[PDB]
């Protein structure tokens, strides 16, 4: 029941046909992303992986707004879309929290993985990174987060 339809898979509920054209359009953008473009550069190669983290994030904001913001789908369709692995359950669970409404991924708040026990730089608000920049006179030595290619996922931002 995660991804391919088997006999143990339950039939889809009512509102799935109206959301299915957008979910098919995310699905074919991942297939172009999965394939290897033969890239010599190390900086181009993780740039391809950032497209996968973004395409994953956007399809989960799609199902999140349909149920928690617009209420356009029944809960029986939402429980089906979680079990059939359309929407990332643990990512939606942070989006419900306060301060985490626009979080890019779960790997960027995971403190144990960092050298310093900190969050990712993409979690720091753009007002604050501009401030110590004014101390130095140099703008920003930060463009994209190494694990996501996130330009800053903070709430105020």
């Amino acid at each position: 029941m995660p991804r391919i339809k088997t006999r143990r898979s339950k039939p889809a509920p009512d509102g799935f046909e109206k959301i299915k054209p957008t979910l098919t359009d995310f699905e074919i953008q991942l297939r172009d992303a999965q394939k290897d473009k033969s890239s010599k550069l190390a900086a181009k190669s993780n740039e391809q992986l950032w497209e996968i983290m973004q395409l994953h994030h956007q399809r989960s904001r799609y199902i999140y707004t349909l149920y928690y913001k617009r209420k356009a789908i029944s809960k029986d369709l939402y429980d089906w879309l979680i079990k059939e692995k359309y929407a990332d359950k643990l990512l939606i669970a942070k989006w419900r929290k306060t301060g985490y409404e626009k979080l890019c991924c779960l790997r960027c708040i995971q403190k144990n993985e960092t050298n310093n026990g900190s969050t990712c730089i993409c979690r720091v608000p753009r007002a604050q990174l501009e401030e110590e920049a004014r101390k130095k006179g140099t703008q920003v030595s930060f463009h994209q987060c190494v694990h996501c290619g996130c330009r800053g996922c903070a709430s105020t931002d």
Binding site: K102, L103, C104, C122, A127, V140, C148, R151, T156, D157
Partner: peptide, 23 residues
Amino acid sequence: FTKSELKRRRKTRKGDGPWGSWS
């Protein structure tokens, strides 16, 4: 910093979301 100043700056970044680029 004020909330109305924050809402005007998040419209300046291009790509509509956390991959929205500054400058």
